[PDB]
RNA sequence: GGGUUUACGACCUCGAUGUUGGAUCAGGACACCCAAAUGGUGCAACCGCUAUUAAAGGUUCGUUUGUUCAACGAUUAAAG
C-alpha cells in the first residue's frame, strides 16, 4: 500500500472504492498499485 | 449505432520555422549594475499587457501574481519541448527574459549596513496574464492535458485555456456580476465611501473592486 | 458471454433453447441464446451440442441444459432477465460441475 | 413485481418467473404538471428522515435502494432520498426491511445505541481527541447537507454541524 | 494545545474569528440607512 | 539453437562478466552453461572510466 | 507592519471581512426549478446523409430482390463468417446488416409491420433474387446454433416451418 | 493449443529460433515440423518466404496451412530491387506496371483470405497497389522500354551515395 | 536465411519483357506479359496515385463515410495520447 | 506543517532568570530501534528496503577526550 494525497489509476484494472472513510485504489492484476487516500 | 460527426480540419494554420521554445538567459547580456527597489506594483492588481491571443490558440493563463525565474523558465521550456509536436504544434513566449534584480544577504549579517548583492533575476507576472501561447493544427484536449502539468508546477495558480475558454469564462463573469442579487456591491460601497469604509480599504481597492487582494485573485467575488 | 467463457464450460453436454420468434417476450431468450452460442463458448469446449429450436405456436420459451453429472437444468424463461438467467445457470454449473 | 421461484426435484432445478399484482399511483396528484414524482406530488423540501411512509415506497425488502432509471426521480431528490434512507436505516427505522438470518439472530450482542440524524457510518468515524479550541473548533456534523433547502417554519437555518 | 503565536490580533498569524449573521445584518441595516441618506441628499 | 537449447552469442565486458556463473545457473535452475573468450577492445563507458580513475587516485594517494 | 503584497494571505481587517461577507455573490434562484418543470418544446432533429443512405438502401433492397429472410446474427468467429459468406456466394445469395434504429421505423411505416418482433436482438437479412430456399436450408443445417427466424418469399411472410415447407415444395 | 502464424523461407526451415522455442513451448517437435515443411515446400524455389499457419491441437499434434508467398517479395521481385526504400514517399525504390500488378493479383488470388472472400481481381489489384506505395515503389500505367534502366542507374548512384553517407555518419558518431 | 537470389538478371530488358517473380516452383516458367489486348479496362480505370479526400468525395456514397470513420478513428487516437493507464 | 541547530528583533528580567558536561530522578510527544498486527517488493528461504496502525516496557558495559558529539572492543531484540 502507498498512502497518497491524490489517488490515480495506473492500469485499466484498478478500481476506486470508498472504505473506512477513505478512498482506496485497489488493483488485482498488479498488487503494487494499491493506493490509499490520506 | 452512432452518427458520424466530421473532424476539425486545419489547413490555413501555417507552422513557422523553429516551433519549439527558445533558450532564455538567467542574467541578460547587460546586467543592471545599479540595484533597484522591489516594487510590488508589478504584481499587485490585474495585468494590463499581454492579455489576449496574438497568433496562437491555447495559452497558460495565470490567475494570480508572483515571480518567474530561470528555474521555472527551464522547467517550462524542457517540458513543452519534450511533450510538444514540432510537426503540428508551435509555442511562443508571452513574458520577456528575467530582468528585475533581487538582492540577498549572507547568513550571519545583522540588519542594515546597506543593500545586499544582486543574486538572480525574475520576471513580474500579474493576475490575468498569459505565459506561454501555443498554436498549430492540434485539438484542445491534448494540449490542455499536457499543459496542466506546467500550470500546476507554476508558482501562481494557472490554467491551460484557449480563446473559447477565455471568452466563456469572461462571459460567465459578466453574467454573474450583472445578475448578482444583493444591491450592495464592493465597487458601489467603495466609490460612495459608505460607512466610512475607506479608512479600512486601500486606494487601489477603488479599482480592484475587491477582486484583487495582494497577489491573490479570487474570480468568484463579482 | 465472457463469464461462460472464463467459467470453463467443458463440463456440459447439451444446451437447447426452444423459442418462438413471433412472440413478445423473446428478447432475453435470444440474448441468452447468443451469449451461450458466442465463439468463446464454442472454443472453450467442442464436445458440447448447442441446439436452437424455433417454433411458431409454442408461446413458451424454455432452456434445457443436460450435463454429465446426470443433471438436467430446465429454465422456463418467459419473464426473467437474460442476465439473471445467465448468472443462475453459471452459479448452478459452478456449484455442480 | 417479478419473483424467481426455484424448485428442486431429483437433481433437476426448475427456475420460473412469477408476476404478481403491484399497486398503482393514486388517481389525483396535486400537481400533475410536474415531471418528477416528488416534484409533482409537491413533496419537494417536505420529506425528512422521519417520514417513513414516503421513503418506504421505493426500497428493496432488504433495505436496498431502487435504481433511478426505474424510479423516475430527478437527480437531486434521488440523492436526497438516498441520504434519508441511509439516515433512517442508521437511526433504527424500517425494522421489517432487514435480511432474515435464523443463525445470526440467536447470538445477541451489545444493545443497539439509540441514534438519529446521523451523517456518517457507525464503523468508520474516529473519535476527536483534540476537539480544538473556540476559534479552531472541530465541529461534529449532524444531518445531511443536501437537505439544507427544506422549508423552515421557524425561519432559523438548520445547524448542519454541532 | 492550540497556542496563538504573539498577540491575539496583531501578529502575522492572527485569530481566525469569523463574521456572524448578526454583524451581516447590522452592516446591511447601516448600508440601507446610508442609501436613504445619500438619496435624500440628491435633490 | 538446436532444439530446446538456444545458444546465445553476445559481447559482455570483462569488468561486468564477474560473478556470472552464480547468476546464470541460478536463473536457469542450473541447466545453463556459458563459455567466453577475449575478443576485442572498445572505449570504456564514462561511469566505469570515472570509477577506475578514482580508484587510481585513491591508490596513488593524492586526488 | 507587513508589506502590501505577501504570501501568508495577509489576513484582513475585521471590517474588511464583514464587507466581503456582505458583498458576497448571490446567484439568481428561480421560483420553480426548471429541471423537473415541463420541458421546453421539442428541438426537432434533422436527417443526416448516413440515415438517408440507409433508408434508400433498405428501400432498394425491399423493392428489387425477392427472397428477404430474417435470421438471428450469431456471434461467430470471423473465419467461419467468411466461410459462410463464400458458401452463400456460391449460390449467389448475399447477406446484409442494418441498425435497428433505422430498420424499425422503416418497417413500421412500410407494409412489413408483421416483422417487428423479429428485429429485437441481432439480425441478419439474407437477400436473394430468384429465391431457392433449398440450398439455404441445407447450408444452415450444417450449423446447429444458427436458426432461421423467418422472412418473406414474394410478399409471403413465413416462419421456419413455412420456409421448410416452401423448400420442400 | 491454438493458431500460430509464421513466415519462413521455402526450404530454409531451420529448427532454431525465432521458430524453435515457440513450438517447443507449445509441445510439438521442431525437427519433425522442419522435415514436414521441407517435404511440403521442396518444389518451391528455396529462398522465398511464404506465410504459414500452424494449428496445434491439445494432443501435441500439428497441422499446417501454407499461403501464397509474401506480397512484399512479389513486389520487390517485380521491381528488381532487393531491399525496399527507407524514406517512403521521399525516394523512389523501383518501377512496376499495371500489367505486373494484375499478374501478381492473379497469382496471389489463390490463397486462404481471397478464397474465403469472394472479391473480384480489382480488390486484389488495389491491395497490391497499396502495398507497393507502402514499399515506396511507383506504379506507372504503361512505360517500360528503357525508362526502367534510366531510373535504375540513378537509383544505383543514389543508393551508393546513401551507403557512403551512412558509413561516414557511423564513423562520425563513433569518433564523437 | 535471406531472400531469393534471382532478381533482375537482365534488368533493362527482362523486366520490361515480362515478370520473373510469377514463377514460384523450381521449374522455371515465366509468364508472358500479355499486352493490353488481353487485360480488361478496369485495370486502367482505377487510381494509381494519391488517394482522394473527404473534401472531394460526395456525402451520398459509402466511401465518403468510410473515410469519415477513418478520420474519426485518427482523431480519437490523437486525443487518446495522454492515457495515464 | 514543526520550531530540534546557527542567525535574525531586543518584548520579560543587569536593587541578579547562577552558565556546559556527568550522578539520582524521570514526565511527555511520535517524525517507532526492539518487541505486536499487516501491504508492496527487482520478496525463492535466512538476511534485506520501504509504507500503515500501535507509546503499557526497555533501549548496555569499557579506552581516549571536560566533553554533547566523535573512533574503536564485546554483546543484545534493540543501544531511536
Ligand atoms: Mg502552481
Ligand atoms: Mg500574535
Ligand atoms: Mg501570546
Ligand atoms: Mg504598515
Ligand atoms: Mg525552545
Ligand atoms: Mg527571524
Ligand atoms: Mg517582566
Ligand atoms: Mg542581568
Ligand atoms: Mg528582586
Ligand atoms: Mg520517561
Ligand atoms: Mg504514528
Ligand atoms: Mg517490529
Ligand atoms: Mg516509552
Ligand atoms: Zn493496477
Ligand atoms: Zn424532480
From Swiss-Prot, chain F:
Location(s) in or outside the cell: Mitochondrion
The record names the disease as: Combined oxidative phosphorylation deficiency 1: A mitochondrial disease resulting in early rapidly progressive hepatoencephalopathy.
Describe the family membership recorded for this protein in Swiss-Prot or TrEMBL.
Belongs to the TRAFAC class translation factor GTPase superfamily. Classic translation factor GTPase family. EF-G/EF-2 subfamily.
Question: Per its database record, what is this protein's job?
Answer: Mitochondrial GTPase that catalyzes the GTP-dependent ribosomal translocation step during translation elongation. During this step, the ribosome changes from the pre-translocational (PRE) to the post-translocational (POST) state as the newly formed A-site-bound peptidyl-tRNA and P-site-bound deacylated tRNA move to the P and E sites, respectively. Catalyzes the coordinated movement of the two tRNA molecules, the mRNA and conformational changes in the ribosome. Does not mediate the disassembly of ribosomes from messenger RNA at the termination of mitochondrial protein biosynthesis.
What is this protein identified as?
Elongation factor G, mitochondrial
Organism ancestry: Eukaryota, Metazoa, Chordata, Craniata, Vertebrata
